[PDB]
């Protein structure tokens, strides 16, 4: 049972309608085939933005990310990562972004 990948949401520096999701700790996993990895998104007030408008998930690499809003409250997010290659994520690396269409 692989450990969860931890990210923290931050407002993008350039575009206020983009949330950056940063890797909290190094995560390296040399895997084989397309795997599913649970991503743990820390609750933060910035997340509320995702509950106000449509959005598009942006991948920062060779993998796909599935995001879902949560029924309860506006400060959480569910996310699963589908890796294509081997997992070599550095701390502080950007995993993904969500672009909000206002």
Query: Using CB under 8 A as the criterion, which residues of the chain lie in contact with a second copy when the complex forms?
Result: 1, 32-34, 36-38, 50, 53-71, 78-80, 82, 84, 94, 96-97, 99, 101
Token pair in block for residue 93? 């690396």
- Residue 88 CB, nearest distance to a second copy (Å)? 16
- Residue 14 CB, nearest distance to a second copy (Å)? 12
* DSSP label of 43: P
3-state secondary structure of 51: helix
Q: Which residue has 């995001």 as its token pair?
A: 67
- Residue 24 CB, nearest distance to a second copy (Å)? 18
């Amino acid at each position: 049972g692989t450990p969860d990948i931890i990210v923290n949401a931050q407002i993008n520096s350039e575009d206020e309608n983009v949330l950056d999701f940063i890797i909290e700790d190094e995560y390296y996993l040399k895997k084989r085939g397309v795997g599913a990895h649970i991503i743990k998104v820390a609750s933060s007030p910035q997340l509320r933005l995702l509950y106000k408008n449509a959005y598009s998930t942006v991948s920062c690499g060779n993998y796909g990310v599935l995001c879902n809003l949560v029924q309860n409250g506006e400060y959480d997010l569910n996310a699963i990562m589908f890796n294509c290659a081997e997992i070599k994520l550095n701390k502080g690396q950007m995993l993904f972004q969500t672009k909000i269409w206002r």
